């Protein structure tokens, strides 16, 4: 069957406007495994952006972390857009800070 992604977006460490960090956008619940996931600084997708291997939970639902290094100053607003056969257009998940 088809299963629609849950999307979350968090840094590795506590957000501190100034020091080097790591932004994670994690997607988990979906099926089929086909998926495009991208990390926006302010509006534009980011260039150097890794993504771990793809696995699946105890009910075959795939899950997939994308991530990237970064540094936030209360200028920028980083966020996570995700498209998949089940979402109707992208969902963007604004990275709410210290959460």
């Amino acid at each position: 069957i088809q299963r629609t992604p849950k999307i979350q977006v968090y840094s590795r460490h506590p957000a501190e406007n100034g020091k080097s960090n790591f932004l994670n956008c994690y997607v988990s619940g979906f099926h089929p495994s086909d998926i495009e996931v991208d990390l926006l600084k302010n509006g534009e997708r980011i260039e150097k952006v890794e993504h771990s291997d793809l696995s699946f939970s105890k009910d075959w639902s795939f899950y997939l972390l994308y991530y990237t290094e970064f540094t936030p100053t209360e200028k920028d607003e980083y966020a996570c857009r995700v498209n998949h056969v089940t979402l109707s257009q992208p969902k963007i998940v604004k990275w709410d800070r210290d959460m």
Partner: protein, 263 residues
């Protein structure tokens, strides 16, 4: 401890994309990685630096390779234009009396349908496309065999050899970094959100106090960082203004007591 492999083939990989791939999990730790545009099984994270029985990967590899041929061939055994998605959950847990309990189930586009029965030494399940793949693999030379070897030897041998060689890894305790922040609800309301960063193992408990007395765990949410440490958070609705009376309590292996997190 369980050693489990997650196995995945799709009929139509999107361009530049592994038609097959596997990851190997020592518990909630990912030790092995294998796509199909490399045909090479490789260690991940800490498990790279493990001194191993060395000729250990060339059996992981040949194993996984042989497993991929069969996977991409289950597709041929199949009805239509599809496209399909076929999944493996294969491994074994070790338990208190020098024992292994082997595991072998498969699913079809997120739906469970095949299982390897080991008394009968086979690939069962009565719903149609089961029969189908069972039988291609059934009538396929000593593959049924090659599995048992996998499931009763290779797996327990592997798992026992991680337990001895990277035991220390298995028991890494990293305490979470805490933060309690407040954002606004409907006027008259606000939400507290206790956020826990980094942290491994995964077990972790959060909760809320208003002046010391328990005032709910919250809505909670969970996921991975990329070093394979973890992230957690719980949010709770509170009467706007009541705010500073509250605090968050975290309970985690890396900690000696529990810990208070003031706003």
């Amino acid at each position: 401890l369980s050693l489990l492999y997650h196995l995945t083939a799709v009929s139509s990989p999107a361009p530049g994309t592994p038609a097959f791939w596997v990851s190997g999990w020592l518990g909630p730790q990912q030790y092995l990685s294998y796509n199909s545009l490399r045909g090479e099984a490789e260690p991940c994270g800490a498990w790279v630096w493990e001194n191993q029985v060395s000729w250990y990967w060339e059996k992981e590899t040949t194993d996984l390779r042989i497993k991929e041929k069969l996977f991409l061939e289950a597709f041929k055994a199949l009805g239509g234009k599809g496209p399909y998605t076929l999944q493996g959950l294969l491994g074994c847990e070790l338990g208190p009396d020098n024992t292994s309990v082997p595991t072998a189930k498969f699913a079809l586009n997120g739906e469970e349908f095949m299982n390897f029965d080991l008394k009968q030494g086979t690939w069962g399940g009565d719903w149609p496309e089961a029969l189908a793949i069972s039988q291609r693999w059934q009538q396929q030379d000593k593959a049924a065999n090659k599995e048992l070897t996998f499931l009763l030897f290779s797996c327990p041998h592997r798992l026992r050899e991680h337990l001895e060689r990277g035991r220390g890894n298995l028991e890494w305790k990293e305490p979470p970094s805490m933060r309690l922040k407040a954002r606004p609800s409907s006027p008259g309301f606000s939400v507290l959100t206790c956020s826990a960063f980094s942290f491994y193992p995964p077990e972790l408990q959060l909760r809320f106090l208003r002046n010391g007395l328990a005032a709910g765990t919250g809505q909670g949410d969970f996921g991975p960082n990329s070093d394979g440490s973890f992230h957690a958070s719980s949010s709770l609705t509170v009467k706007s203004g009541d705010e500073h009376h509250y605090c968050c309590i975290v309970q985690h292996a890396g900690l000696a007591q529990p810990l208070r997190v003031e706003l």
